[PDB]
Enzyme design. Structure first.
Site, PDB file in Angstrom:
ATOM      1  N   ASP A 102     -13.100   5.212   0.559  1.00 43.53           N
ATOM      2  CA  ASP A 102     -11.695   5.321   0.971  1.00 43.53           C
ATOM      3  C   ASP A 102     -11.271   6.783   0.896  1.00 43.53           C
ATOM      4  O   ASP A 102     -10.957   7.290  -0.186  1.00 43.53           O
ATOM      5  CB  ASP A 102     -10.793   4.447   0.093  1.00 43.53           C
ATOM      6  CG  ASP A 102      -9.316   4.389   0.608  1.00 43.53           C
ATOM      7  OD1 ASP A 102      -8.890   5.288   1.381  1.00 43.53           O
ATOM      8  OD2 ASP A 102      -8.577   3.443   0.218  1.00 43.53           O
ATOM      9  N   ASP A 132       0.877  -1.164   0.000  1.00 43.88           N
ATOM     10  CA  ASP A 132       0.000   0.000   0.000  1.00 43.88           C
ATOM     11  C   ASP A 132       0.914   1.213   0.000  1.00 43.88           C
ATOM     12  O   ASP A 132       1.486   1.569   1.030  1.00 43.88           O
ATOM     13  CB  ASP A 132      -0.925  -0.026   1.215  1.00 43.88           C
ATOM     14  CG  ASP A 132      -1.748   1.263   1.390  1.00 43.88           C
ATOM     15  OD1 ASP A 132      -1.574   2.229   0.609  1.00 43.88           O
ATOM     16  OD2 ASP A 132      -2.578   1.300   2.335  1.00 43.88           O
ATOM     17  N   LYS A 160       2.600  11.407  -3.916  1.00 43.33           N
ATOM     18  CA  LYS A 160       1.519  10.716  -4.610  1.00 43.33           C
ATOM     19  C   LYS A 160       0.543  11.707  -5.236  1.00 43.33           C
ATOM     20  O   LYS A 160      -0.233  11.331  -6.122  1.00 43.33           O
ATOM     21  CB  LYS A 160       0.785   9.779  -3.639  1.00 43.33           C
ATOM     22  CG  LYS A 160      -0.259   8.838  -4.289  1.00 43.33           C
ATOM     23  CD  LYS A 160      -0.797   7.855  -3.293  1.00 43.33           C
ATOM     24  CE  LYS A 160      -1.757   6.890  -3.913  1.00 43.33           C
ATOM     25  NZ  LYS A 160      -2.327   6.003  -2.857  1.00 43.33           N
TER      26      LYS A 160
HETATM   27  N1  LIG Z   1      -8.041  10.048  14.152  1.00 46.71           N
HETATM   28  C1  LIG Z   1      -8.018  10.745  12.992  1.00 46.71           C
HETATM   29  N2  LIG Z   1      -8.958  11.673  12.696  1.00 46.71           N
HETATM   30  C2  LIG Z   1      -8.930  12.371  11.544  1.00 46.71           C
HETATM   31  N3  LIG Z   1      -7.987  12.211  10.600  1.00 46.71           N
HETATM   32  C3  LIG Z   1      -6.987  11.312  10.774  1.00 46.71           C
HETATM   33  C4  LIG Z   1      -6.950  10.509  12.003  1.00 46.71           C
HETATM   34  N4  LIG Z   1      -5.868   9.708  11.920  1.00 46.71           N
HETATM   35  C5  LIG Z   1      -5.265   9.969  10.732  1.00 46.71           C
HETATM   36  N5  LIG Z   1      -5.934  10.923  10.054  1.00 46.71           N
HETATM   37  C6  LIG Z   1      -5.584  11.449   8.720  1.00 46.71           C
HETATM   38  O1  LIG Z   1      -5.649  10.394   7.760  1.00 46.71           O
HETATM   39  C7  LIG Z   1      -4.751  10.684   6.693  1.00 46.71           C
HETATM   40  C8  LIG Z   1      -3.910   9.450   6.387  1.00 46.71           C
HETATM   41  O2  LIG Z   1      -4.778   8.360   6.104  1.00 46.71           O
HETATM   42  P1  LIG Z   1      -4.190   7.088   5.341  1.00 46.71           P
HETATM   43  O3  LIG Z   1      -2.913   6.674   6.046  1.00 46.71           O
HETATM   44  O4  LIG Z   1      -5.291   6.084   5.105  1.00 46.71           O
HETATM   45  O5  LIG Z   1      -3.815   7.796   3.952  1.00 46.71           O
HETATM   46  P2  LIG Z   1      -2.982   7.144   2.745  1.00 46.71           P
HETATM   47  O6  LIG Z   1      -3.509   5.781   2.399  1.00 46.71           O
HETATM   48  O7  LIG Z   1      -1.510   7.346   3.020  1.00 46.71           O
HETATM   49  O8  LIG Z   1      -3.377   8.232   1.618  1.00 46.71           O
HETATM   50  P3  LIG Z   1      -4.117   7.925   0.213  1.00 46.71           P
HETATM   51  O9  LIG Z   1      -4.870   6.629   0.390  1.00 46.71           O
HETATM   52  O10 LIG Z   1      -4.998   9.145   0.080  1.00 46.71           O
HETATM   53  O11 LIG Z   1      -2.997   7.851  -0.797  1.00 46.71           O
HETATM   54  C9  LIG Z   1      -3.902  11.855   7.155  1.00 46.71           C
HETATM   55  O12 LIG Z   1      -4.406  13.037   6.516  1.00 46.71           O
HETATM   56  C10 LIG Z   1      -4.154  11.934   8.644  1.00 46.71           C
HETATM   57  O13 LIG Z   1      -4.053  13.256   9.176  1.00 46.71           O
HETATM   58 MG   LIG Z   2      -4.725   4.760   1.257  1.00 43.24          MG
END
Ligand SMILES: Nc1ncnc2c1ncn2[C@@H]1O[C@H](COP(=O)(O)OP(=O)(O)OP(=O)(O)O)[C@@H](O)[C@H]1O
Ligand SMILES: [Mg+2]
Length: 532
Positions: A194, A8, A70
């Site tokens: 998502d 991922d 990304k």
């Molecule tokens: N408890 C929470 N409440 C609100 N937002 C959160 C929380 N925990 C994490 N985030 C937010 O979630 C985001 C990261 O989510 P995730 O790791 O699923 O993204 P990713 O898979 O890296 O990104 P993408 O899928 O968009 O490429 C960040 O913007 C972070 O600030």
């Molecule tokens: Mg993601």
């Protein structure tokens, strides 16, 4: 070969999983964390840091700490999204020679696939350390709504990292695999919502068991590849910048170091507000002027946060409606609502989604790890360790060619199942016309001019003839990764001659091989319609 690992590769966080026999398993990294920040930093001392070590020095080195790449990979420099981010980001975004969006660090110009390859390299090493053998094959994830160029540039990133990309899997589809391997012999229709750090997808997916074999079929997908928690943070950052300017008379945007501190405090505050009603941003010595040093201390309530980002949440609801329309289902046809991604932990997001579907989301899905698990299951389907599992995905965008009169003719509609081979026969517009122009378009609009242009080539050598008589067959071929090739051939050619092009601008083989070698330098250092 080795094991096919599942990566991922996220805007904010990345995560790697493997098949442990018949069980997918997420891997802790060297720091002991099950996810790794997608952050790449180049030090003055000339080391390349990936993950948490890059993250913790961003505030002292914002200009050479790369993040949210990304949101640039596979994009043109002139993209409206890229033009906005040029002013916002602390690092230097520039135009490459072909016009793609690139990044300049310490004088050196870098393609986003190179940078993302640093994250992929870390994830690759994490699996090797765990498995005690080299890894050379991988399934890598992309947002379902990624276009052709974005898919191809991600596939390049894996090659630059030393990985053979056995499959590019759409992120909601990976999440559906992870969710549905468990559940038994029950036909289900699911919506996977998502919302991540950078992208937003919605996919409508049917999981049917024919007799012992589970079939996963994407009915429709939609989303927005540039809508994500980074945008939630930016709204909070701007409010903090404005409130500090109002009652202190200082504009912090001139100060890259203060703005890096502010970005980190805003994201922390946003997160705390998912379980608290209020919190404080405290940044001592955020700036200084003739009257002396200055500190930021401001209360942020959940209510204020919600008004700052509510239209971002509403922006995610409109693709839901289109996806239900393209699938031909109402919300009551949906058996399960699945929330994936860290930004779905916000209560307002959860409430808006549940209200729209009239149903509470499932709780038995891991919003941080389901995508990685699914990538790994995909690799077990490819090797054959996972059996009786069929995957039927789609491509997200309508693709076609320009025909006579500025008209867009669609050869592949959005949500067509892939891999795809769609052919149609076209003819010359004039008489004794010796060539036709094949102009590739992506979009839904009636006029060719309102859609996005992807590429063009000319098929010459048409034998002189009346208009409309030559038979020019144009074929659109989309593989299992969602990547498109377009072909045209004159059906009366003696040798059946055919011209084929890739659909998107990207790296050529000279650049990739040079970058592949630079990546081992760093590793040793560490017919009816008418054509004009
Ligand atoms: N408890 C929470 N409440 C609100 N937002 C959160 C929380 N925990 C994490 N985030 C937010 O979630 C985001 C990261 O989510 P995730 O790791 O699923 O993204 P990713 O898979 O890296 O990104 P993408 O899928 O968009 O490429 C960040 O913007 C972070 O600030
Ligand atoms: Mg993601």
């Amino acid at each position: 070969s080795g094991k096919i690992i599942g990566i991922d590769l996220g805007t904010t966080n990345s995560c790697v999983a493997i098949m442990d026999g018949t069980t997918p398993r997420v891997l802790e990294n060297a720091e002991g964390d099950r996810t790794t920040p997608s952050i790449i930093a180049y030090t003055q001392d000339g080391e390349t840091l990936v993950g948490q070590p890059a993250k913790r020095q961003a505030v002292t080195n914002p200009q050479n700490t790369l993040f949210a790449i990304k949101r640039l990979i596979g994009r043109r420099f002139q993209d409206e999204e890229v033009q906005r981010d040029v002013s916002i980001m602390p690092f230097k975004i520039i135009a490459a020679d072909n016009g793609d969006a690139w990044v300049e660090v310490k004088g050196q110009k870098m393609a986003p696939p190179q940078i993302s390859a640093e994250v992929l390299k870390k994830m690759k090493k994490t699996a090797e350390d765990y498995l005690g053998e080299p890894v050379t094959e991988a399934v890598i994830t992309v947002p379902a709504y990624f276009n052709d160029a974005q898919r191809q540039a991600t596939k390049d990133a894996g090659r630059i990292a030393g990985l053979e990309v056995k499959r590019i899997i759409n992120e909601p589809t990976a999440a559906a695999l992870a969710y549905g391997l468990d559940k038994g012999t029950g036909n289900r229709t699911i919506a996977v919502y998502d919302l991540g750090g950078g992208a937003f997808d919605i996919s409508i997916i049917e999981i049917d068991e024919v007799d012992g074999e589970k079939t996963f079929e994407v009915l429709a997908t939609n989303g927005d590849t540039h809508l994500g928690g980074e945008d939630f943070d930016s709204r909070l950052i701007n409010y903090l910048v404005e409130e500090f300017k109002k009652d202190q008379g200082i504009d912090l945007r001139n100060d890259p170091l203060a703005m890096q501190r502010l970005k980190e405090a805003a994201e922390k505050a946003k997160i705390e507000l998912s379980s608290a009603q209020q919190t404080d941003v405290n940044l001592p010595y955020i700036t200084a002027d003739a009257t002396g040093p200055k500190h930021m201390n401001i209360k942020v309530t959940r209510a204020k946060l919600e008004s700052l980002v509510e239209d971002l949440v509403n922006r995610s609801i409109e693709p839901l409606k289109v996806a239900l329309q393209d699938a031909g289902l109402s919300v009551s046809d949906i058996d399960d609502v699945i929330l994936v991604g860290g930004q779905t932990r916000m209560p307002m997001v959860q409430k808006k989604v549940a209200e729209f579907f009239g149903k509470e989301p499932r709780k038995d899905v891991n919003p941080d790890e389901a995508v990685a698990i699914g990538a790994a299951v995909q690799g077990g389907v490819l090797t054959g360790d996972v059996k009786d599992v069929l995957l039927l995905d789609v491509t997200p965008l309508s693709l076609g060619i320009e025909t006579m009169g500025g008209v867009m003719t669609t050869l592949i509609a959005k949500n067509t199942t892939i891999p795809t081979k769609h052919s149609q026969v076209f003819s010359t517009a004039e008489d004794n016309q010796s060539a036709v122009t094949i102009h590739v378009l992506q979009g839904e609009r009636k006029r060719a001019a309102d859609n996005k242009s992807l590429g063009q080539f000319n098929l010459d050598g048409i034998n002189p003839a009346p208009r409309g008589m030559p038979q020019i067959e144009v074929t659109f071929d989309i593989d299992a990764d969602g990547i498109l090739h377009v072909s045209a051939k004159d059906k009366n050619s003696g040798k059946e001659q055919k011209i084929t092009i890739k659909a998107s601008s990207g790296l050529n083989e000279d650049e990739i091989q040079k970058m592949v070698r630079d990546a081992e330098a760093n590793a040793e250092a560490d017919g009816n319609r008418l054509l004009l």
